CSV table of C-alpha atoms in Angstrom, one decimal:
chain,number,residue,atom,x,y,z
A,1,UNK,CA,4.6,-8.3,2.3
A,2,UNK,CA,5.4,-10.4,5.9
A,3,UNK,CA,4.8,-7.8,7.5
A,4,UNK,CA,2.9,-5.7,7.2
A,5,UNK,CA,0.4,-8.3,7.0
A,6,UNK,CA,0.4,-8.6,10.5
A,7,UNK,CA,1.2,-4.1,11.3
A,8,UNK,CA,-2.6,-3.3,10.2
A,9,UNK,CA,-3.6,-7.6,11.7
A,10,UNK,CA,-3.3,-5.3,15.1
A,11,UNK,CA,-4.8,-2.1,13.7
A,12,UNK,CA,-8.0,-3.7,12.6
A,13,UNK,CA,-8.6,-6.0,15.3
A,14,UNK,CA,-8.4,-3.8,17.7
A,15,UNK,CA,-11.4,-1.1,15.7
A,16,UNK,CA,-12.9,-4.0,14.9
A,17,UNK,CA,-11.7,-7.4,17.2
A,18,UNK,CA,-13.3,-10.3,16.0
A,19,UNK,CA,-15.6,-8.8,12.9
A,20,UNK,CA,-11.7,-8.4,11.7
A,21,UNK,CA,-10.4,-10.5,8.0
A,22,UNK,CA,-8.0,-12.9,7.7
A,23,UNK,CA,-4.1,-13.5,7.3
A,24,UNK,CA,-5.3,-15.7,4.7
A,25,UNK,CA,-8.1,-12.4,4.1
A,26,UNK,CA,-5.8,-9.4,3.7
A,27,UNK,CA,-3.0,-11.2,1.8
A,28,UNK,CA,-4.7,-12.6,-0.6
A,29,UNK,CA,-6.5,-9.1,-1.3
A,30,UNK,CA,-2.9,-7.3,-1.1
A,31,UNK,CA,-1.7,-9.1,-4.1
A,32,UNK,CA,-4.9,-7.8,-5.7
A,33,UNK,CA,-3.8,-4.7,-4.8
A,34,UNK,CA,-0.1,-5.3,-6.6
A,35,UNK,CA,-1.1,-7.0,-9.5
A,36,UNK,CA,-3.8,-4.3,-10.1
A,37,UNK,CA,-1.3,-1.7,-10.2
A,38,UNK,CA,-3.7,0.1,-6.9
A,39,UNK,CA,0.1,-0.7,-5.3
A,40,UNK,CA,4.0,-0.6,-5.5
A,41,UNK,CA,4.1,-2.0,-1.9
A,42,UNK,CA,2.0,-3.5,0.8
A,43,UNK,CA,4.1,-0.2,3.1
A,44,UNK,CA,1.9,1.7,1.2
A,45,UNK,CA,-1.9,1.5,3.0
A,46,UNK,CA,0.8,3.6,4.8
A,47,UNK,CA,-0.4,6.6,2.7
A,48,UNK,CA,-3.9,7.2,2.9
A,49,UNK,CA,-4.6,10.1,0.2
A,50,UNK,CA,-4.6,6.9,-2.5
A,51,UNK,CA,-7.2,5.2,-0.9
A,52,UNK,CA,-9.8,6.9,-3.3
A,53,UNK,CA,-8.2,5.1,-6.5
A,54,UNK,CA,-8.1,2.3,-3.8
A,55,UNK,CA,-11.5,1.6,-2.6
A,56,UNK,CA,-13.5,3.6,-6.2
A,57,UNK,CA,-12.2,0.2,-8.3
A,58,UNK,CA,-13.0,-2.0,-5.6
A,59,UNK,CA,-15.7,-1.1,-5.5
A,60,UNK,CA,-16.2,-0.4,-8.9
A,61,UNK,CA,-15.2,-4.1,-10.0
A,62,UNK,CA,-17.7,-5.7,-7.4
A,63,UNK,CA,-20.7,-3.4,-8.5
A,64,UNK,CA,-19.5,-3.9,-12.3
A,65,UNK,CA,-18.1,-7.9,-12.7
A,66,UNK,CA,-19.8,-8.6,-9.4
A,67,UNK,CA,-17.5,-10.3,-7.0
A,68,UNK,CA,-15.9,-8.1,-3.8
A,69,UNK,CA,-13.8,-10.8,-3.0
A,70,UNK,CA,-11.0,-7.8,-2.3
A,71,UNK,CA,-14.1,-5.2,-1.3
A,72,UNK,CA,-14.6,-6.4,2.0
A,73,UNK,CA,-10.8,-6.7,2.7
A,74,UNK,CA,-10.8,-3.5,2.0
A,75,UNK,CA,-13.3,-1.8,4.1
A,76,UNK,CA,-12.9,-3.9,7.2
A,77,UNK,CA,-8.7,-3.0,6.5
A,78,UNK,CA,-10.3,0.7,6.5
A,79,UNK,CA,-12.3,0.7,9.4
A,80,UNK,CA,-9.8,0.0,11.1
A,81,UNK,CA,-6.2,2.7,9.4
A,82,UNK,CA,-9.4,5.4,9.1
A,83,UNK,CA,-9.5,5.5,12.7
A,84,UNK,CA,-6.0,5.5,12.8
A,85,UNK,CA,-5.5,7.9,11.5
A,86,UNK,CA,-7.8,10.7,13.2
A,87,UNK,CA,-6.2,10.4,16.1
């Protein structure tokens, strides 16, 4: 909502680098992860046990609707966290 955008922006930069997303990207993806009912708060990203219902949905709408405007962001924000919760 304001902090998470940065709390995760620093992680993706250390797990991806320049390839990482942007404050504009994540910010938009978040609003979508809250409207779809997939998340109740921006801090929900700290729940690695909810990435399942959040990864299948995004990949489902993209494969079906034909647009991964939010997937490209999820995959990135995930590729970083997944590594942060492994060490």
